[PDB]
């Protein structure tokens, strides 16, 4: 993950953030983008969480570090649009 050269060479996602802990930034360095910085790094150890689409009734998903947000449309709500 870290070394004298692991973080001195070119930043590639096919290198640093994959086979250790991927603590931080090494998922942001590759892209230079703090938008999905903490909406994807939660999916390094335990697997994805929105791939099941818990929200039904045409509701979008949002991943948080422990709980899932389900955006349901006007007049629709719920923990999973439930």
């Amino acid at each position: 993950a870290n070394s004298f050269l692991e973080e001195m060479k070119k930043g590639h996602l096919e290198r640093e953030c994959m086979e250790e802990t991927c603590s931080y930034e090494e998922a942001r360095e590759v892209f230079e983008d703090s938008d999905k910085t903490n909406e994807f790094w939660n999916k390094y150890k335990d697997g994805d969480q929105c791939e099941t689409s818990p929200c039904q009734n045409q509701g979008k998903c949002k991943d948080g570090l422990g709980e899932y947000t389900c955006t349901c449309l006007e007049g629709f709500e719920g923990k999973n649009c439930e």
Partner: protein, 48 residues
Amino acid sequence: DRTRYFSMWNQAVDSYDPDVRIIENHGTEDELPNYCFPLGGIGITDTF
């Protein structure tokens, strides 16, 4: 004298260095380690 040289007669006797044939080895002076550095000096950095 034979030490000095003259061109037209090819005046030069073959000579061998003294220390080459007989070595007087004494080591060196190695009390300071020599360091090379990155072209920008400071190698790696983090974002702050």
